[PDB]
Write a protein that binds this ligand. Structure first.
Ligand SMILES: *CC(=O)N1CC[C@@]2(CCN(S(=O)(=O)c3ccc(Br)c(F)c3)C2)C1
Ligand SMILES: *CC(=O)N1CC[C@@]2(CCN(S(=O)(=O)c3ccc(Br)c(F)c3)C2)C1
Ligand SMILES: [Cl-]
Ligand SMILES: [Cl-]
Ligand SMILES: [Mg+2]
Ligand SMILES: [Mg+2]
Ligand SMILES: [Mg+2]
Ligand SMILES: [Mg+2]
Ligand SMILES: [Mg+2]
Ligand SMILES: [Mg+2]
Ligand SMILES: [Mg+2]
Ligand SMILES: [Mg+2]
Lengths: 236, 9, 236, 9
């Protein structure tokens, strides 16, 4: 690995620099390098890892959607034949996206998840596992679409089980997990009623626990609650 | 319109 | 070259797709591939080449500036020592930037410029040569800073000479060349008075030729004229 | 503030 020769602390320092410079591919490579040092990650370090890869895959997802839409339009009546280029280029972007997802899932499997024993770490990593299977599901169109969906669901469910046992209802990791699992249900699993039910229950139980929080923790929880509400407005 | 998932901090 | 096996028309088609998907590194690679087919480029194809590389280098320049500023701040009094990481990472970004500039200059030298005989093509390519030497100058801090600056100036001057002989004062390529040469004078060559004089003369001579234009050509010219004016406001 | 150069079309 190209980062094998760089100190862990230096990789973290450079990931932060790359974040400031909006160099997210670099940021991801630095954080991969840090993970591969084999030490567990702190809360802040998990955040750097998450930000880096979310930005990389987010660019890929946006591009894939543009290309898929062009492709879909070319495969209708009245549409002039234009050769294999749109499909080829969509496939190229798709393959790169799957590559990034497989890299993240590889880090989680080797060995972030198994070493994570605290609730905050374990729930964060399992959420991440669900998210990156979800991204794979967005582009899957084969035998394995079903199995990918089940992998995402399994990761999210395991995370949900721990979060409900171990964290308060306002915990931001717990809230973001529930938000993303509700998106999984609505957008991937064709279960809009499960999506709405989860979003409603999560919102209501968080609302009732806000009183326990400091002003700063309150700010964090209510941010995610607003997104649950925005989705509920969208979905109903 | 697509559903909103968790943002970056 | 990885694009050696793909048809020219396919490379152009995919560059346009990549533009739509905001995949500018891909767009640049496709257009490099097209250039390397050895045929002269059309006006639209020159635009694809220009857009792709401007976006790539523009990202690099923005990142380099962020990092240079952090670096500059770390090298003052009161500033705590933080090791080599900021300099290393700034150098990494710098090297990649220089690489892109050298790639573009390589395409222009092999063999876009020498095959360009029409004024629109020759002026466009020489402007580009000036621009990419200018970008190299922005990060140069050595013996060769002077020689890089002179290379940029030489390219711009050759372009200016052709443009004044061969194009009307409202020609958008002529206008953009003059805009960028005025930026060269102000930002790189420590010649703000030359910058202001060029911007003023260019603006005034274009103003006097607007009457000759169709509504569409008028739109194009006045866009660039506004930027000359915006700089003149900034500079005075 | 930096000078404005030619934009992309
Ligand atoms: C402590 C810890 O492990 N953290 C805190 C930040 C983060 C990284 C990403 N998340 S998240 O996806 O659960 C999430 C993202 C955004 C927001 Br506003 C949020 F509250 C949570 C947890 C790792
Ligand atoms: C005909 C031709 O060779 N063209 C037209 C577009 C372009 C590509 C970039 N330029 S430019 O840098 O001279 C320029 C950029 C933006 C604008 Br609004 C402009 F008028 C000119 C010429 C190649
Ligand atoms: Cl392709
Ligand atoms: Cl580095
Ligand atoms: Mg060490
Ligand atoms: Mg037809
Ligand atoms: Mg595929
Ligand atoms: Mg542990
Ligand atoms: Mg051929
Ligand atoms: Mg001190
Ligand atoms: Mg250097
Ligand atoms: Mg020729």
């Amino acid at each position: 690995g190209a980062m094998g020769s760089m100190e862990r602390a230096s990789l973290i320092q450079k990931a932060k620099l790359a974040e400031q410079a909006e160099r997210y591919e670099d940021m991801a490579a630095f954080m991969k390098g840090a993970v591969e040092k084999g030490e567990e990650l702190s809360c802040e370090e998990r955040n750097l890892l998450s930000v880096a890869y979310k930005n990389v895959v987010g660019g890929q997802r946006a591009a894939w959607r543009v290309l898929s839409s062009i492709e879909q339009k070319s495969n209708e009546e009245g549409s002039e034949e234009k050769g294999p280029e749109v499909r080829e280029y969509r496939e190229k972007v798709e393959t790169e996206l799957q590559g990034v997802c497989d890299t993240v899932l590889g880090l989680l499997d080797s060995h972030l998840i198994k070493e994570a024993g605290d609730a905050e770490s374990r729930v964060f990593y399992l959420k991440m596992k669900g998210d990156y299977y979800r991204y794979l599901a967005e582009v899957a169109t084969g035998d394995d679409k079903k199995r990918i969906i089940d992998s995402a669901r399994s990761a999210y469910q395991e995370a949900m089980d721990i979060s409900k046992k171990e964290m308060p209802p306002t915990n931001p990791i717990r809230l973001g997990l529930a938000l993303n699992f509700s998106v999984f249900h609505y957008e991937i699993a064709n279960s809009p009623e499960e999506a709405i039910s989860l979003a409603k229950t999560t919102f209501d139980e968080a609302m009732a626990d806000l009183h326990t929080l400091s002003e700063d923790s309150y700010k964090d929880s209510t941010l995610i609650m607003q997104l649950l509400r925005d989705n509920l407005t969208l979905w109903t | 319109q697509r559903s909103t998932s968790t943002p970056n901090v």
